Write an enzyme that holds these catalytic residues in place. Structure first.
Site, PDB file in Angstrom:
ATOM      1  N   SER A   1       0.843  -1.191   0.000  1.00 59.79           N
ATOM      2  CA  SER A   1       0.000   0.000   0.000  1.00 59.79           C
ATOM      3  C   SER A   1       0.888   1.255   0.000  1.00 59.79           C
ATOM      4  O   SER A   1       1.649   1.422  -0.957  1.00 59.79           O
ATOM      5  CB  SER A   1      -0.922  -0.051   1.144  1.00 59.79           C
ATOM      6  OG  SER A   1      -1.902   0.945   0.932  1.00 59.79           O
TER       7      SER A   1
ATOM      8  N   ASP B   1     -12.010  -5.460  -4.411  1.00 58.40           N
ATOM      9  CA  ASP B   1     -11.846  -4.653  -3.169  1.00 58.40           C
ATOM     10  C   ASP B   1     -11.280  -3.273  -3.542  1.00 58.40           C
ATOM     11  O   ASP B   1     -12.002  -2.530  -4.230  1.00 58.40           O
ATOM     12  CB  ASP B   1     -10.982  -5.400  -2.150  1.00 58.40           C
ATOM     13  CG  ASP B   1     -10.749  -4.629  -0.860  1.00 58.40           C
ATOM     14  OD1 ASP B   1     -11.332  -3.525  -0.706  1.00 58.40           O
ATOM     15  OD2 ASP B   1      -9.960  -5.113  -0.037  1.00 58.40           O
TER      16      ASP B   1
ATOM     17  N   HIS C   1     -13.390 -13.031   0.873  1.00 60.85           N
ATOM     18  CA  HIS C   1     -12.860 -14.105   1.772  1.00 60.85           C
ATOM     19  C   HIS C   1     -13.584 -14.072   3.132  1.00 60.85           C
ATOM     20  O   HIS C   1     -14.760 -13.645   3.158  1.00 60.85           O
ATOM     21  CB  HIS C   1     -11.323 -14.007   1.889  1.00 60.85           C
ATOM     22  CG  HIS C   1     -10.804 -12.811   2.629  1.00 60.85           C
ATOM     23  ND1 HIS C   1     -10.570 -12.821   3.997  1.00 60.85           N
ATOM     24  CD2 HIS C   1     -10.434 -11.584   2.194  1.00 60.85           C
ATOM     25  CE1 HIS C   1     -10.101 -11.647   4.371  1.00 60.85           C
ATOM     26  NE2 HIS C   1     -10.007 -10.870   3.281  1.00 60.85           N
TER      27      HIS C   1
END
Length: 677
Positions: free
Chosen positions: A532, A617, A652
């Site tokens: 990230s 996501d 998930h």
């Protein structure tokens, strides 16, 4: 061997401050996620990664197996007592999800099931528990659940007397809620139906139609997160409003009906504060008088009447505090160490909690009852698995409550060190490293250097079971405590953000060069990883110092920085001007552009690299890494490995989420270990 995928070039000019940047891969962004050409490029890259890493399947199996073999007795949490009941969390083998149980405090033998996530997940595609709390009267359970995988939480209420559920659901919440002291009224945070940012506080009566809920407060500036808290005293529910730099707290009487928010201190730019209430006083952690924060006591809101308990100090960062019957306990950072200190309310006696390890972290753990002399605190180090301690604040008796269990592990096999590196500007940067003693030979071991370096988030030295897979194959594992992190307090953060963000990348390069010069590793076998904002680190460092590293893992990397920070339609952008800057101003456009990794890809040799992203996501949008790989394939002059791995999954959760996490680590570690051979 194999021809990699080649994304079509569609020159897309972006002109800012009269500077035209031509982005050939702007089209890989599709907010709608339907464009079949965008999917074909992501799928093509996944198939290439699958093909290139096929020979590492046997190693990936070996790593996954040895990583899962370190864990189990599946898991029971340390019980805690809250309002006369004892609570435990249980993971059984063959259960995907935790079961939460409780018993009256004076009971030993029998436990009642509070909630079984396996039962709640029945006939659902996804399940995440985002919060759980029994009412003050022990009769009702509030739960925040996500069944849809969008981090929008549904709040529901269970009658514990007969295990019946009430009829109503509170939808599209942050999962943040607090009970009024009547055990009948809850406050909760509603997300905006477009932005999904938490923005409204509602009062709900349990059992009733959420149509009847009362709007208590609405936040106008969506850079301010809306959270709820409840004071140690139970006298107030707090509406905690905060941006990255600025706070404001409103108080709700938790005892009386028809409460309205009561201002504490009106928001003021660069004044961060948090409060609690206990012993008929407000306690405030505030940076009003210094960046490293101080602790104040008040009888009323007025900032002018705040009494100094702990003044801000240049050499000590105040992170937080817990209040107990006879003691204040604070969490602090000094000289690159986390520390706990206790101060007696009456005597003023000060005690420091002592350790003996060069590379550890300590923190305040869960302490839900203040009428006790027993403090629960956490400990972890690079050599000592994570531990929960109970300390008698009066007698100093220190008792272990729970240790992380690690199978096939002998701690004396490893050694750790703290190293301080004088950076190119003469600033001292701390480093924490660990290795296996019996395979260590100076100048010969592969290095893995891990960094983050944004948001004042610290890469605190702590134990990792997965890390043993590298240490047991001769790696020296390094945490580089670079500027932009929080290891040396607020000024360490501020000296690695905005117009100082380059210090983050420089520090990472300086630490790596120093460790090689000092004989900690093989100059030819230096690896790095980050994710990230740590992926921004990876991207900047390989552009700036491409020959330093053999191979890199860049997870979900923030690399298209200027283009993303010019576009408020991207989630995060309007909240991140106080991190990177606002490139709508030429001064920030120039400063960011200089390190923006996508912009600074050049026709030069790069290290081997594995890049990860996620389609369904984000956090960093999936397109940034995909554009970055496309541009690197176009320009880089070497013939080294470059792979993009895109998580395609619908989502998930539960043990299969932990399954997926081990599979991903095994794939990344096999990639690195194959390069180190």
């Amino acid at each position: 061997h194999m021809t990699p995928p080649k994304a079509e070039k569609r020159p897309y000019p972006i002109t800012t401050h009269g500077d035209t940047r031509v982005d050939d891969y702007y089209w890989l962004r599709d907010d709608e996620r339907t464009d079949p050409q965008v999917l074909d490029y992501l799928q093509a890259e996944n198939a290439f990664t699958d093909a290139a890493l096929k020979p590492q399947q046997a190693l990936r199996e070996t790593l996954y197996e040895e990583m899962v073999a370190r864990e189990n007795l599946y898991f029971q949490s340390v019980p805690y007592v809250r309002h006369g009941y004892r609570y435990q969390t249980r993971f059984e083998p063959g259960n995907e999800y935790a079961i939460y149980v409780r018993q009256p405090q004076a009971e030993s033998e029998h436990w009642d099931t509070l909630i079984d996530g396996n039962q709640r997940a029945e006939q659902r595609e996804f399940y995440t528990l985002g919060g759980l709390e029994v009412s003050p009267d022990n009769q009702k359970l509030a739960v925040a659940e996500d069944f849809l995988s969008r981090r929008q939480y549904d709040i529901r209420f269970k009658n514990l007397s007969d295990d019946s559920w009430t009829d109503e659901v509170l939808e599209n919440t942050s999962g943040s809620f607090e009970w009024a002291n009547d055990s009948a009224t809850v406050y909760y945070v509603r997300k905006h139906a477009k932005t999904l940012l938490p923005y409204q506080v509602y009062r709900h009566v349990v059992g009733t139609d959420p149509q009847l809920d009362e709007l208590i407060y609405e936040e106008q500036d969506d850079t301010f997160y809306v959270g709820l808290e409840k004071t140690t005293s139970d006298r107030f529910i707090l509406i905690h409003l905060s941006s990255t730099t600025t706070s404001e707290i409103l108080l709700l009487d938790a005892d009386r009906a028809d409460s309205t928010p009561q201002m504490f201190v009106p928001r003021r730019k660069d004044h961060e504060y948090g409060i609690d209430h206990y012993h008929q006083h407000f306690y405030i952690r505030s940076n009003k008088d210094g960046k490293n924060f101080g602790l104040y006591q008040s009888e009323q809101a007025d900032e002018a009447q705040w009494q100094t308990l702990i003044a801000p100090r240049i050499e000590v960062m105040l992170e937080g505090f817990s209040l107990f019957r006879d003691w204040l306990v604070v969490e602090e950072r000094s000289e690159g160490l986390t520390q706990l200190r206790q101060i007696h309310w009456q005597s003023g006696e000060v005690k420091r909690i002592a350790f003996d390890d060069p590379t550890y972290t300590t923190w305040l753990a869960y302490n839900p009852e203040p009428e006790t002399e027993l403090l629960r605190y956490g400990y972890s180090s690079m050599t000592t698995p994570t531990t929960l301690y109970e300390l008698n604040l009066d007698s100093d008796e220190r008792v272990m409550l729970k240790q992380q269990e690690v199978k096939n592990f002998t701690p004396e096999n490893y050694r750790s060190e703290r190293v301080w590196v004088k950076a190119r500007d003469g600033v001292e940067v701390p480093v924490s490293l660990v290795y296996r003693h019996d395979s260590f030979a100076r100048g010969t071991n592969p290095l893995m250097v891990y960094g983050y370096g944004s948001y004042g988030s610290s890469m605190d030295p702590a134990f990792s079971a997965s890390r043993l897979s590298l240490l047991d194959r001769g790696f020296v594992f390094v945490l580089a405590h670079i500027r932009g992190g929080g290891e040396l307090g607020q000024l360490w953060y501020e000296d690695g953000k905005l117009f100082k963000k380059q210090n983050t990348f420089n520090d990472f390069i300086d630490v790596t060069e120093a460790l090689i010069a000092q004989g900690y590793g093989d100059a030819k076998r230096v690896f790095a990883m980050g994710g990230s904002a740590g992926g921004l680190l990876m991207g900047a460092v390989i552009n700036q110092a491409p020959e330093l590293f053999n191979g890199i893992v860049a997870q979900v990397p923030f690399v298209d920085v200027v283009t993303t920070m010019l576009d408020e339609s991207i989630p995060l952008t309007t909240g991140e001007y106080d991190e990177w800057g606002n490139p709508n101003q030429q001064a920030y456009y120039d400063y960011i552009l200089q390190y923006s990794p996508y912009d600074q890809v050049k026709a030069q040799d790069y290290p081997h690299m594995l890049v990860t992203t996620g389609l369904h996501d984000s956090q960093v949008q999936y397109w940034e890494p995909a554009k970055w790989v496309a541009k690197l394939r176009e320009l880089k002059t070497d013939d080294r490995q470059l792979l993009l791995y895109t998580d395609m999954d619908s989502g998930h959760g539960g043990k299969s989420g932990r399954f997926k996490a081990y599979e991903d680590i095994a794939l990344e570690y096999a990639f690195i270990l194959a390069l180190a051979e």
